[PDB]
Write a protein that binds this ligand. Structure first.
Ligand code: POV
Ligand code: POV
Ligand code: POV
Ligand code: POV
Ligand code: K
Ligand code: K
Ligand code: K
Lengths: 474, 441, 440, 441
């Protein structure tokens, strides 16, 4: 179950034998054995995108293997065009799994996606070859296999759902997506420029007809190689100067191409800059802290025993500042946060020295309202003479007891996991007559004085002189 | 001074500025005398710009000093006539007359009226400091116009340099085509533009390069300009890349932190998915602007009560607990109620729980199931507008029925202690209890 | 040391440093012996650079260990001598002396004069840390100068390589210009300057490319250098652009999602702009507030005390409590008294909580609002010079009469513990605070 | 393991790597059979790498899971023997045997010796993780090396697919040089390196371009590689520039929004001088140490009171006050003393004020400038380790004399409140007042 499965693993999850959403004659859009099929379809899109431009420009690929190859791709895409009737879909505004065939059908048909896919899937050139005797020709008729570029939306969806999955590197996925869009545009520009040169009258005034005269007679892969080479040398801005624009059509298309290329390449450099800058944002911030420590301890002459007491400490500060970012449930609804808090802290809380013998009502009103903090191994949580707003129940690590005195300080007691601290002040309402400092990376639970007291003496009535009994025992 | 009748207009003089920004340098470069097809469509634009140097006296200018329009006729007159008057006045003298005073000044004259480009500069400064406009496509378009205009005026200067030269066969363009002075203006413009873009972009094929020293000198400065312009472009495209990339990039960090949290504490694999569902829901209903606490908490409750009022007041009296109550207590209630969303099939309230909260439905629906040696005992359902867990709270007995969402619900929450201390006003609690007792009957 | 006359003499030498940075490579490359039009200007410039050598014995230097200008003669002399005196001296020996010493050194000798560029380096290092100068336009003028210098030096070195070649028609410039050793000096300089820009820029038209291996090697190293130089220019521009607007995208999105929500549920226009106003107001009054961390860094309490005195000292004599206590203790109390800003209609001291902060207001309009049984009313609207929240901190009692603002009020906070550990010492005051406190 | 001589030896097999990185591509591309001037040097290197094949048994193998370095003489011999053994072994096989077994392999075979490049990557990993090495000079060198290596391998491959072409005239190099197979290896190598660096830097003059389809495909892939490589280089250079200038940019914002704070106020320029004279000085004593406060305070008070005891203890005990006092009182109050710096000609304690604080000098000097109604005269020369203004605070009389720093010196502040709260905690008040009234003699 859950709305997390459909919206989180990029390739879906394993469906076990008795999922409650499973139904007869339905496949769930988040199933793995589907989000793997619809990746096979993306692998096929990677070929259809290439082939559509290729046989648009080159016009002699049809009389060969590519014509029969894109039929067994116009089949797998016709299988899916009916398979998407038994496919659930996450309903917005009611985050359910619509699973009635009627509603799936009605949402599919009423969308442009259905007619666009039934167009893109139509093998019109094979239709011509079977009705007539051959494809044969066309300066514009070959524009029909440009519909197959509609399939490119699947690659968009894939890259869109790989950049929300956090198991995959975020900027790295953007750089591979940018690399794919580039080598697609290199292909598009190469084929378009070859198309322009192929249908030009008097072919010796083209960009390719000047170098190789009979380019209309050579194997299509010589032409394809020349075009890819040209588009690469003007994409990358090398520009050797052989293979330049000769007539006005090529000049115009070419200066539109290399006008868009400025923005494309500046984009690529921007993406790589952000990748590099963010990937090395924390390592430096940690290094810039070890640096000034060494500078300060070397300008002065501190011994290198108390210079590895500052280095072996700030590591703890980085760790503890990181551990309070793994605090995420500061916004989740209370009805659920008060269940994580339950499962985590009810044991620690109910068998505490003072809470003993409390009814479950106040226990839950407590556990629901607490939140945990962390503390470096030497900071003091509460020092003496403050007015007692808080008192802590430590869950891990330790905390040492000290007081105020003429002498520096004295270590009285060591507190272990599951023990209260600083409660004398918060109970007796007198300012905190003690000081408590940690001795290891420890986790604490704080309780506001006002809310705790108003809660204990108002919500429940069955609480009297047993807290006194236990309080007196100490 | 502010209405549409001065915004469908002042933004109509911007398509007339884009026209002048193409025509003026083209006249400079490629033409020497006012040929017909442009010597009449350039007085039209002059009239339209002459209409505006008078319709700018009857226009209120607002300073932040006055914080509002001025409406003072003489003040507007003297304020306009101070700085942008002589420029706007000369910009619209017809070329056809400025040639009568001194010929050979035609080309250089119709480049004064590039002063009008201040209106495009102004429109962009306006578009950037405004919303409803995708900021990614008003910086990926200002730089594009700067680039196109630079390319254009460079082409038109570099062709003039070659046209005003003796022995045209020693120019940058005469080197390629023997007789370029006998080709269509389309051809020469396309060739100039082609060179200018091959140079701007640093491709540099190598045909169409400088030949003599005037062209070499011009090209030195053109390349020096482009070197800075390209670095400036790459400096901006780095900003626009981290844009809208801060809510899909924090979501990844949120999910990662949640996974680490569930790891360290060894949470069972039932609260982990229950937590991830809510975390994803918070990101879905943030892409829809359905609810943003970070834009509600930021305001003080003295304002943040008016929004909650306008959004829930109408709903808050069609509930049987608050039939007859002075509106002030109702206002205090609707003030301190936090709205929170819930994914489908989740237990906001489960049976035999310590009663602590009570919710009010505003969206969706939900069922009141009960389990007693058996689930699936649907007893009833609730619709947007009813209240749940009220008797369990106001009677301090454990919850009676268990509520599970059936859609993407949204609820208004109020815990017990706040409701109790806010009900400690006058006897209205009597009305409340009277209502709840007559409710079940 | 610092006189305006000296600071303009030093800025006038930079003018001739820019002249040297062009003339030295120019005669290294294009000339083989001193010629009148340039052999007398350089001597003038050497004269000034020689006078500077004798006057840099009469300028004090700021000792970085004790920030004093040393008017001692001998220390100045010896410091200069050790640091760089002979280097500044060979930098001004006239080229006629070198020619009389040995010919064929005129070129390589007046490249030592490029030692003077330390002055322009120091000038830039001095400007980009000044506050009266735009950092953008100053950092851009350095990238421009470095680039122009690199282009010029490469032009001159490349032409030198072509001119010293035995066969002149086997060179990069000799390939196009048949007889370039008889063309003008202006045309030759322009051609080689144009080559080195289609190369630094990476246009590379294709005419004027290397022909033999010496040129290929020079060009290999030049293009290697240019790779790094261009990466460095782009890295500097990307930093001038990105840092200039760093928070604007944060403020923009937190102020735009507000509109998204306010017009996703169709909020009325009258109300939906009060929230945007309060947003764009709170974004200022907190930034302006944390900009008062410059009192935590000017932390020497003989300075921050004088600031916090001048800002609000007359105020602390028109208050209800401190009317007639004393002057001395007032100084130390106001010196531990820090100000805060609050947007309109926010609460500073909510009723019924633990007394911690004694507050004082200087301007703005705040109200003494009271929370009723189930409603809210007011008793008073506190104005300038009046104390709020004093009721409770001196009593240990929970606070009364919650306070709310109407605009920015610029309050003045004094905390509980600080107050009491102040009053325990200096026991001259005590019960006089009360004497005027329980007066009402 | 970590020995001094060992680390020196490993850092010697690295220059031998740098040698192989140049030589193995060079024999791949440019040579067909071993030649003396090189077939004698790459046998030496093979001996020096075979030596390290045996010496890598007697090494201190270290595991990360257990911080102990395994000094066992037989567990290292079973880990190294697992992963990098046959690789490092075949890499040092002399090519004279690989030819004996099969000719036409000398090229592709000794390209295996590129396997000894893991050493360079390991050395760079060790360098950047280190802290004694400027991150600038360690990152801006891994890029130079990978760039030079790419340029070199591209040169050799592009020459190899030209030397093996069945007709040397239709090649990328035979189009310029008639017979390039009869030229010095120096000249051929330079031409190839020149081509490859012209196409990596995107200059692309136009001489030396692909001529047939094999070179075209190689070049397509090479330029695709260069696109990403250059984007990566610009990314790293931007990262270097951003962090390199991050300091000045912060001092500038400090001065900016500390003049602003004086503008949204009306401060007389005199104190607007001392403020900017103290802020700048605060930045010159932070780029140099001695005042790294916002680091020192982020430490626990159990260390921040151990540092400021190692510095100011052997200083404070020499004051004429604190003559006889328990060491622990010293250690206690010295813990709490905020050290601050002062520019010269600055009045720290100007005469006739409230005696609030008292300072102790550690550096610099000043004098007790004595000002009557109208006069300025000085009688004192305070040095390191002397009190000031304490007579005022220990008698609550107004300050005796002005004090003006005559240099730049740092003092220790200790307010009267904290001092009186400390002194009562002990009985040393007796000895303090004793010494103090004794000072009057
Ligand atoms: C002048 C004007 C201004 C110009 C501005 C330039 C900006 C360009 C960015 C466009 C972009 O990223 O696309 C965006 C949308 O589209 C996608 O994300 C599609 C991703 C791939 C689609 C096709 C992949 C090809 C398949 C492979 C086939 C190989 C073919 C055969 C190969 C031989 C994503 O952008 P963003 O960054 O998320 O925002
Ligand atoms: C060394 C030398 C170095 C110099 C290097 C220069 C760097 C470039 C900076 C310039 C710049 O960006 O301008 C600024 C302002 O820009 C404007 O105000 C935009 C106005 C648009 C111009 C006209 C557009 C009409 C296009 C019509 C088409 C014409 C016809 C085209 C025909 C096809 C940038 O924005 P910012 O953030 O304020 O800064
Ligand atoms: C592969 C390798 C890669 C190498 C690539 C590295 C890039 C080089 C950068 C060097 C640099 O920034 O200098 C640094 C030194 O301080 C300076 O800024 C020096 C100032 C320049 C003096 C020259 C100006 C002469 C006047 C011009 C007269 C023109 C002559 C006439 C022209 C017609 C600045 O560093 P930063 O400031 O910390 O940043
Ligand atoms: C589309 C296609 C896109 C392709 C994208 C490619 C771009 C990035 C390239 C790879 C790369 O970045 O390397 C990584 C280094 O990797 C290493 O481990 C460094 C080892 C360097 C070898 C040095 C040999 C020195 C010999 C020198 C002598 C040679 C002789 C020269 C004589 C002239 C980069 O750093 P990082 O740590 O990964 O971060
Ligand atoms: K280029
Ligand atoms: K180029
Ligand atoms: K070129």
């Amino acid at each position: 179950t859950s709305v997390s499965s459909s919206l989180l693993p990029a390739f879906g999850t394993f469906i076990e034998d008795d999922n409650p959403s499973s139904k007869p004659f339905i496949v769930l859009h988040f199933d793995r054995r589907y989000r793997l099929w619809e990746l096979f379809l993306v692998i096929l899109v990677g070929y259809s995108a290439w082939a559509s431009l290729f046989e648009l420009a080159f016009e002699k690929a049809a009389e060969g293997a590519l014509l029969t190859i894109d039929l067994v791709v116009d089949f797998f895409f016709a299988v899916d065009i009916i398979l998407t009737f038994f496919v659930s879909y996450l309903d917005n505004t009611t985050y359910l799994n619509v699973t009635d065939h009627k509603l799936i059908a009605k949402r599919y048909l009423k969308s442009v996606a259905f007619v666009m896919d039934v167009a893109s899937t139509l093998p019109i050139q094979f239709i011509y070859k079977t009705i007539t005797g051959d494809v044969g020709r066309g300066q514009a008729f070959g524009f029909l296999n440009l519909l197959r570029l509609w399939r490119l939306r699947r690659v968009a969806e894939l890259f869109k759902r790989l950049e929300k999955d956090a198991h995959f590197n975020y900027f790295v996925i953007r750089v591979i997506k940018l690399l794919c869009v580039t080598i697609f545009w290199i292909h598009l520009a190469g084929c378009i420029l070859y198309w322009i040169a192929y249908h030009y009258p008097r072919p010796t005034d083209t960009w390719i007809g000047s170098q190789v005269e009979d380019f209309k007679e050579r194997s299509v892969w010589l032409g394809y190689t020349y075009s890819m080479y040209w588009s690469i040398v003007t994409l990358t801005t090398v520009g050797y100067g052989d293979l330049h624009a000769v007539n006005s059509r090529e000049k115009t298309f070419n200066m539109f191409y290399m006008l868009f290329n400025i923005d494309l390449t500046s984009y690529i450099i921007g993406i790589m800059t952000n990748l590099v800058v963010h990937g090395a944002l924390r390592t430096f911030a940690m290094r810039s802290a070890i640096n000034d420590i060494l500078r300060y301890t070397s300008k002065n002459r501190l011994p290198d025993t108390m210079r590895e007491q500052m280095l072996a400490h700030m590591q703890l500060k980085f760790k503890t500042a990181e551990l309070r970012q793994e605090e995420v449930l500061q916004d989740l609804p209370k009805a659920i946060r008060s269940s994580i808090n339950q499962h985590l802290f009810r044991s620690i809380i109910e068998e505490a020295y003072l809470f003993k013998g409390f009814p479950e009502g106040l226990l839950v009103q407590l556990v629901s309202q607490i939140q945990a903090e962390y503390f470096p191994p030497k900071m003091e949580i509460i020092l003496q003479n403050e007015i007692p707003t808080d008192f802590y129940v430590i869950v891990s690590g330790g905390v040492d007891i000290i007081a105020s005195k003429g002498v520096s300080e004295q270590v009285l007691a060591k507190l272990g996991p599951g023990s209260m601290a600083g409660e004398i002040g918060v109970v007796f309402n007198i300012p905190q007559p003690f000081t408590v400092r940690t001795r290891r990376l420890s986790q604490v639970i704080r309780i506001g004085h006002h809310k705790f007291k108003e809660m204990v003496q108002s919500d429940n009535d069955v609480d009297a002189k047993m807290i006194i009994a236990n309080f007196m025992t100490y | 001074p502010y209405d549409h009748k001065y915004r469908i207009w002042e933004a109509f003089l911007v398509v007339l500025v884009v026209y002048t920004a193409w025509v003026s340098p083209f006249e400079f470069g490629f033409l020497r005398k006012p040929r017909p097809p442009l010597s009449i469509t350039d007085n039209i634009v002059n009239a339209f710009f002459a209409i505006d140097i008078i319709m700018t006296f009857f226009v209120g200018y607002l300073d932040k000093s006055t914080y509002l329009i001025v409406d003072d006729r003489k003040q507007i007159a003297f304020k306009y006539l101070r700085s942008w008057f002589l420029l706007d006045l000369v910009s619209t003298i017809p070329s056809e007359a400025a040639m009568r005073i001194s010929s050979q000044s035609y080309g250089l004259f119709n480049m004064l009226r590039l002063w009008r480009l201040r209106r495009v500069g102004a429109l962009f400064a306006r578009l950037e400091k405004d919303r409803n406009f995708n900021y990614f496509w008003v910086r990926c378009a200002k730089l594009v116009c700067v680039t196109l205009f630079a390319v254009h005026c460079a082409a038109c200067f570099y062709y003039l340099i070659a046209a005003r030269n003796s022995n045209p066969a020693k120019t940058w363009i005469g080197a390629n085509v023997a007789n370029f002075l006998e080709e269509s203006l389309w051809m020469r413009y396309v060739t100039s533009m082609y060179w200018s873009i091959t140079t701007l972009t640093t491709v540099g094929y190598g045909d169409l390069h400088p030949v003599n020293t005037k062209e070499m000198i011009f090209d030195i400065f053109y390349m020096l300009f482009n070197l800075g312009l390209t670095a400036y472009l790459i400096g901006n495209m780095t900003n626009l890349v981290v844009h809208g990339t801060s809510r899909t990039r924090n979501f990844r960090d949120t999910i990662q932190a949640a996974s680490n949290f569930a790891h360290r504490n060894h949470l069972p694999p039932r609260l982990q998915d229950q937590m991830l569902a809510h975390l994803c829901l918070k990101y879905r209903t943030d892409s829809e602007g359905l609810q943003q606490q970070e834009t509600l908490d930021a305001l003080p409750k003295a304002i943040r009560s008016s929004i909650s009022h306008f959004l829930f007041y109408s709903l808050m009296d069609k509930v049987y607990l608050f039939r007859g109550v002075s509106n002030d207590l109702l206002f205090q209630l609707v003030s301190e109620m936090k709205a929170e969303y819930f994914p489908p099939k989740e237990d906001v309230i489960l049976q035999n729980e310590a009663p602590t909260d009570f919710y009010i439905l505003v969206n969706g629906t939900a069922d009141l199931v009960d389990v007693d040696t058996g689930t699936e005992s649907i007893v009833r359902e609730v619709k947007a507008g009813d209240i749940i867990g009220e008797i369990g709270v106001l009677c301090y007995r454990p919850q009676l029925f268990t509520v599970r969402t059936k859609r993407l619900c949204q609820l208004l929450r109020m815990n017990r202690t706040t409701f109790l201390n806010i009900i400690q006003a006058n006897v209205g609690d009597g009305t409340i209890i009277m209502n709840n007792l007559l409710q079940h009957l």
